[PDB]
Design an enzyme around this catalytic site. Structure first.
Site, PDB file in Angstrom:
ATOM      1  N   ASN A   8      11.374  52.529 -21.149  1.00 50.99           N
ATOM      2  CA  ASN A   8      11.509  52.005 -22.571  1.00 50.99           C
ATOM      3  C   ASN A   8      10.374  53.393 -23.114  1.00 50.99           C
ATOM      4  O   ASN A   8       9.014  53.510 -22.839  1.00 50.99           O
ATOM      5  CB  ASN A   8      11.172  51.173 -23.392  1.00 50.99           C
ATOM      6  N   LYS A  15       6.578  52.256 -22.159  1.00 52.51           N
ATOM      7  CA  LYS A  15       6.307  51.098 -21.085  1.00 52.51           C
ATOM      8  C   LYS A  15       7.375  50.627 -20.647  1.00 52.51           C
ATOM      9  O   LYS A  15       8.756  51.064 -20.535  1.00 52.51           O
ATOM     10  CB  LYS A  15       6.193  49.440 -22.752  1.00 52.51           C
ATOM     11  N   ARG A  96      15.895  51.746 -22.265  1.00 56.17           N
ATOM     12  CA  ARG A  96      16.209  51.865 -23.901  1.00 56.17           C
ATOM     13  C   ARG A  96      16.912  52.214 -24.465  1.00 56.17           C
ATOM     14  O   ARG A  96      15.990  53.577 -24.127  1.00 56.17           O
ATOM     15  CB  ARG A  96      15.221  50.832 -24.507  1.00 56.17           C
ATOM     16  N   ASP A 155      20.162  49.273 -28.589  1.00 49.40           N
ATOM     17  CA  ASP A 155      19.896  48.547 -29.541  1.00 49.40           C
ATOM     18  C   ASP A 155      20.702  48.291 -30.081  1.00 49.40           C
ATOM     19  O   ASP A 155      20.889  47.316 -31.098  1.00 49.40           O
ATOM     20  CB  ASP A 155      18.931  49.061 -30.183  1.00 49.40           C
ATOM     21  N   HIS A 216      12.069  41.570 -37.571  1.00 51.08           N
ATOM     22  CA  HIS A 216      11.331  42.281 -36.092  1.00 51.08           C
ATOM     23  C   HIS A 216      10.308  43.011 -37.102  1.00 51.08           C
ATOM     24  O   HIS A 216      11.133  43.366 -37.446  1.00 51.08           O
ATOM     25  CB  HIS A 216      12.544  42.482 -35.498  1.00 51.08           C
ATOM     26  N   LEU A 217       8.605  42.926 -37.059  1.00 53.01           N
ATOM     27  CA  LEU A 217       8.288  43.747 -38.230  1.00 53.01           C
ATOM     28  C   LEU A 217       7.458  43.848 -37.102  1.00 53.01           C
ATOM     29  O   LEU A 217       6.797  43.538 -36.137  1.00 53.01           O
ATOM     30  CB  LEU A 217       7.395  42.742 -38.847  1.00 53.01           C
ATOM     31  N   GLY A 218       7.459  45.887 -37.201  1.00 51.16           N
ATOM     32  CA  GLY A 218       6.816  46.599 -36.499  1.00 51.16           C
ATOM     33  C   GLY A 218       6.680  48.107 -37.214  1.00 51.16           C
ATOM     34  O   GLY A 218       6.998  48.617 -38.105  1.00 51.16           O
ATOM     35  N   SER A 219       6.249  48.892 -36.199  1.00 51.40           N
ATOM     36  CA  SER A 219       6.378  50.493 -36.767  1.00 51.40           C
ATOM     37  C   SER A 219       7.554  50.901 -36.688  1.00 51.40           C
ATOM     38  O   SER A 219       7.933  50.991 -38.471  1.00 51.40           O
ATOM     39  CB  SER A 219       5.597  51.728 -35.061  1.00 51.40           C
ATOM     40  N   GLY A 220       8.723  50.285 -36.522  1.00 53.64           N
ATOM     41  CA  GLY A 220       9.884  50.188 -37.317  1.00 53.64           C
ATOM     42  C   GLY A 220      10.073  48.637 -37.293  1.00 53.64           C
ATOM     43  O   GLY A 220       9.609  47.882 -36.473  1.00 53.64           O
TER      44      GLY A 220
END
Lengths: 431, 430
Positions: A8, A15, A96, A155, A216-220
């Site tokens: 990824n 990762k 990915r 994705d 789905h919460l994060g940097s994006g």
């Protein structure tokens, strides 16, 4: 001995996971960190499980002195001349790739086979901000491992089910033939798929009976409405920019705003290697939490809601940023709950799921969202929501809550291995 | 004798009302229709209240062929043709201007006064696609009525109450200092203010007790969440482009979409007589219903939902376009109902209001929206929904409905006249 590597590739880290073939037993976690940095040195770390391999860290050059195309081969060297794994033993590498356009399934890329390679280049060219590295890593692997098969998993795949009335952009034909139509695609599909499967296993029912809203919460960050296990709407659009703001991305704004904001917005940014408009750089890299709060770290924003941990200026920026994110997030949760509830009763929905880096750690954010849904009968369980009591699938609402709330840990690389298992025929039981 | 003219210049139609002041007795309605049409000629109609003049109707060129700036002068001409109105008597002219930026109230514009003219020019050059037409109307009025005062009243005023967490765009500082911040502004404010007052009167309670979601549907459509009589959120953003798609406008799409769609998107379109990017032209003039259905007329789209009335292809385009519009509309209705319901019980919201050209006519659209709200306890009343009984406010839901539904007819020109009264201090004594 045979392995599958699932990687990824992000802007700041790579990762990966190493799997045993044909077992698909997870062997190792891999991480390459500090990719951007001019000050810190690129770190490469392997982390086996129980008794699969002896941990070992490796420090390479400072990130700003390493081409991205050289990271995976450095990672590959680290794997081989530091552990028991041989390059010719890596039969498969899953990647990915964010934007898969209209593809229903992953694409094999095999050295010499023109089709997969040309398709990959078209995807890279259409959305380079998102796919560049994704394609670069694949190219490097083809070079370093001449006999493996690469599998690109996108994705966008999970959202191929969305109906025309949802995905359609009301635009005339473009001035030129494009690689794919301009429409909503939607992203984070590997996470959404993984989440649905985890929740289905937890609830002991098939995934095709899962009805849920996921944040789905994060940097994006995004959100998705899932009915019968399938995406029916999601917050991201043609690219991951649309929808919720992010660490450095603006999220949805008037499509004309950028023309006011910046002169010659369509002109080449002359940053990086690939051509990309100034507009796309500003909106994806200079906006979002970074522009509003001075930090991309939402946990740091949550801290600064306490005016004793910061200046008055940073407390005030944190208050605003937090409130903007919560407002935009509530907007989509509303749309998607509404869309589910228009067809099925609340009792028949599996609930509201939070995931992602922010989704897992942001207890305050989850509590505030759930309080807003009190009129629907959601009731947070303060301990469960606040405690570190584990489980990849964790309930955070009270037993009598009419809306169930969950935190679910995503495993994108694990999901990619599961897709590859199917892709390469390991589920065939013919007669 | 003194009159106030209230003029509302849209891309599809111009509407106006002439009022005696301070009585606010209506004397004339003015309507210019078919302005964007390709097969119907622009129609200019002046209709007088009994005693004030002879109704007059006239045809001009096709809407897609007409010089827009010629329209307001013809209207002024029709007005002064009455034996009961002279130019010198028209002392005030109220104008609907879409984008007022940060203004909290209207701006007075008088011939020979730099203050008003300058500010009007700043707003016209910030959003010329939305403001330029109204601004030309102002200069026509100055030229024809050198002693009148124009008052510009903005669609953005109603939304000045929206909170920072709602209006903030997560952008860095712009590269230059701009006329106004880049943020959500919101529009159709004169319509929303009018709707709130109408509903308040009908329910016999103060406007500050009104809690409603409004879907104002027409060539340009938006939705607004109103709490205690005030806008707390609304679908349009920096410009009316954001939010719902419209006759020729894309509505909300990925901000980078246009850069794939068109080369050199940020460059001057060089068409008409103002500076505007190709992007802005494409997203506002060539998108929306036009692009999806090959028509700008949502009424034609609805008609084409019946496959017997059109070709197979037009039936397919209509179905999609109609479904796209309904999907986007429900998204905002969902956002805003949730926003209200997050604080007040459903029993104490006044309900869901439909307005605008499409909102008033689209019985089947309101039916489809209410059907999606069944889970909240909404239930349409077929007979009331199709009633032409008349009246600025009509209930369209069944007595049993947990969520009340309404159709409210906007009176933007009448609302402008009310705002003028407060601005200039007209009131008849005794």
């Amino acid at each position: 001995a045979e392995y599958l590597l699932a990687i990824n590739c992000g802007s700041s880290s790579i990762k990966g996971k190493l799997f045993a073939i044909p077992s698909f037993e997870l062997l190792a976690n891999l991480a390459v960190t500090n990719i951007s940095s001019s000050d810190e040195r690129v770190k490469i770390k392997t982390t086996w499980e129980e008794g699969k391999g002896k941990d070992s860290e490796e420090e390479a050059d400072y990130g700003d002195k390493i081409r991205y195309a050289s990271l995976v081969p450095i990672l590959l060297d680290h794997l081989t001349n530091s552990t028991h794994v041989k390059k010719e033993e890596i039969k498969y590498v899953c990647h990915r790739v964010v934007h898969g356009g209209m593809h229903d399934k992953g694409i094999r890329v095999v050295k010499g086979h023109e089709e997969g390679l040309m398709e990959m280049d078209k995807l890279s060219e259409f959305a380079p901000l998102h796919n560049h590295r994704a394609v670069l890593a694949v190219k490097s692997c083809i070079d370093a491992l001449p006999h493996h098969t690469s599998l690109l998993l996108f994705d966008t795949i999970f959202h191929r089910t969305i109906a025309p009335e949802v995905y359609t952009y009301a635009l005339p034909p473009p001035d030129t033939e494009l690689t794919m139509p301009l429409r909503k695609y939607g992203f984070h599909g590997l996470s959404y798929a993984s989440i649905v499967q985890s929740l289905a296993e937890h609830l002991k029912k098939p995934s095709d009976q899962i009805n849920v809203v996921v944040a789905h919460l994060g940097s994006g960050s995004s959100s998705c409405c899932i009915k019968n296990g399938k995406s029916i709407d999601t917050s991201m659009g043609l690219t991951p920019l649309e929808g919720l703001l992010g660490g450095t991305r603006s999220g949805t704004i008037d499509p004309t705003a950028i023309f006011h904001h910046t002169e010659d917005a369509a002109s080449d940014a002359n940053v990086g290697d690939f051509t990309v408009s100034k507009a796309e750089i500003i909106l994806n890299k200079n906006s979002g939490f970074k522009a509003l709060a001075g930090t991309t770290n939402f946990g740091h924003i949550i801290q600064n809601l306490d005016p004793s941990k910061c200046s008055e200026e940073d407390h005030e920026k944190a208050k605003l940023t937090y409130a903007v994110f919560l407002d935009r997030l509530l907007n989509f949760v509303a749309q998607y709950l509404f869309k589910l509830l228009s067809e099925v009763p609340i009792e028949s929905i599996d609930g509201l799921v939070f995931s992602g880096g922010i989704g897992e750690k942001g207890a305050e954010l989850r509590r505030d969202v759930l309080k807003k849904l009190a009129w629907l009968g959601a009731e947070v369980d303060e301990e469960a929501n606040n405690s570190n009591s584990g489980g990849a699938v964790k309930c955070i609402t009270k037993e009598g809550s009419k809306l169930k709330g969950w935190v679910v840990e995503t495993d994108e690389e694990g999901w990619m291995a599961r897709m590859a298992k199917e892709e390469f025929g390991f589920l065939e039981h013919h007669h």
